[model samples]
Target: STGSATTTPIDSLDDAYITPVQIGTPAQTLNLDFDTGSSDLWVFSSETTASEVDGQTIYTPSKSTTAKLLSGATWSISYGDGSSSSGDVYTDTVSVGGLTVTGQAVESAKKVSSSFTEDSTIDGLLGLAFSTLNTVSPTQQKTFFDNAKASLDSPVFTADLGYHAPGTYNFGFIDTTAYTGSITYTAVSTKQGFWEWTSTGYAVGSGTFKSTSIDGIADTGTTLLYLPATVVSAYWAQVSGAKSSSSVGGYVFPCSATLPSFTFGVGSARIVIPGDYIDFGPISTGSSSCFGGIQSSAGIGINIFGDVALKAAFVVFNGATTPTLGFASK
Candidate 1:
């Protein structure tokens, strides 16, 4: 058994990607962000505070005959961006694309951060990370992928994120036609509950590749690519009128400045991020200063290869006993 789902960016800047997911008996569809960085399938629900609800859909367990309360279970999660949510848990039938899982844990949000309330495009998050990261208390629950993995033809899933376009998430089998060139496989470490791996080296634009080991997580939930300060500074130096701004809280540059592409190594294979991808967008509407998509991860304590880098290639997350990551040019 396999499944395929279409994911689309919520905004022009590709702030987040959301995919449709079905919940309960009557099948209430919600646009959920498939986050690889966290492991809790949470959603806005009838339990949510009325004042916090905006232009987002809500899941009402009482309306579904198959929904059963996971009594005494609760969950709370906080993101790197400082946003947070807490809720009760329920077990229900959940489906993504055509793949269905019975008794999938569905966390219903009772309280949410202001940032989440303001984002009308996202209804919730569907975590694809390891089940060990699940935030439930009393008794932890498996993620949608974990519960469905045994039924899948293969223990694998692929993320084909797009730039200002629709992408796809496929479970069970690798779609060879989705990518170009041969896939370069690398070992993955799930000890940290993340899809963490080490990049061999990096090069700024057309510069020579610098040999170094850079460890980071591949997070589809995050919007930007974060690397070491040294690499970030080197990349910005190539662009004129670029500087770190305290006001903007990141590296910003003249909108007219020419941006350089970034390249990182996966084993012997190299994936190049186009220059346009690094030019995140103007800090404000019609502003001459633009924010960069590539930033220093010093503050975060860990580098993250987010959508900016992932969109440049097709990525495979292998869930074998000894997990591995596969990257291919597309």
Candidate 2:
């Protein structure tokens, strides 16, 4: 049987999707960021500094009789965007959607960076990346999906993200009805702990798609699509007043700019991203300027097909046999 769960969008940030997860014997529900870029299930916990806690719901493991502390073990992680968290460890029963995994290692945060402390409403992060990327010291830990895969009917999960709307993350099964057209599959290279793959080519608007190998990963945690500098420059060329802004980060364009659709080639599949979605809202209040969702991945080395890109297609993070990615029109 397959387990399923509904994921809600956060405050129009177009950031990460939040899913309700229960941990411990008593089942303390926490809204967690379902991140595919890292492998670690961590949460704001009783140990977190009170001053650092803001809008997040903390998980108290002491309340759960089934919780057991991992003696002398600790974990800490720093993300690409500079957010950091460090904490001790506990083993308890964890459940997502309707699937349950007993004796799963859950990292409890004792300290966190302001990037996380001030973030909207995410309680913690549920890493969906490969188990090999687990960040626990001494002995690495497996993620919720990895621990639950053994009991699942099939090792697969599908991500369906709608633009500024609630979506669904299906575990152990793919809902054919969720997407239009046949799903195009691509080979994934997981040495980097990401669902990394290569795009055949892409075109802005209805222009010719020049053939090239565009390396990138499917990162739901990221808000925008990040590609190479040359590619990003080509797309924004059509938009008037579009330029890379140092103050706001990434490219910015006028709100009235006539945007064009962006398309990516995946095998025989052609996924088209609407122009409006690229206008990532206003750069700030009291102004009509908007930021471009597509930016350069110069610093990150590899491109990121983030939420802006993923939402344009129905994506499958296939875990069965040779890991692969499936993309279909929505």
lDDT of each: 0.96, 0.89
lDDT of 2 at 3: 74
Q: Which one is best on lDDT?
A: 1
Q: What is the TM-score of candidate 1?
A: 0.99
RMSD score of candidate 2 (Å): 1.1
RMSD of each: 0.6, 1.1
Give a tens-digit lDDT track for model 1, residues 1-330. 999999999999999999999999999999999999999999999999999999899999999999999999999999999999999999999999899999999999999999999999999999999999999999999999899999999999999999899999999999999999999999999989999999999999999999899999999999999999999999999999999998998999999988999999999999999999888789999999999999999989899999999999999999999999999999
Estimate, for each residue in 1-330, the C-alpha lDDT of model 2 and write its tens digit: 577888998777666789999998789999999888888899999999998899798999989988999877789888878799999999999988888899899999999999889885899999999988888989899988888887888899888988889899988888989999899999999989899999998999989987788999998888889999999999999888898888887899998887899999898779999997887778888578988889999998889999899999999999976999999998
lDDT of 2 at 199: 93
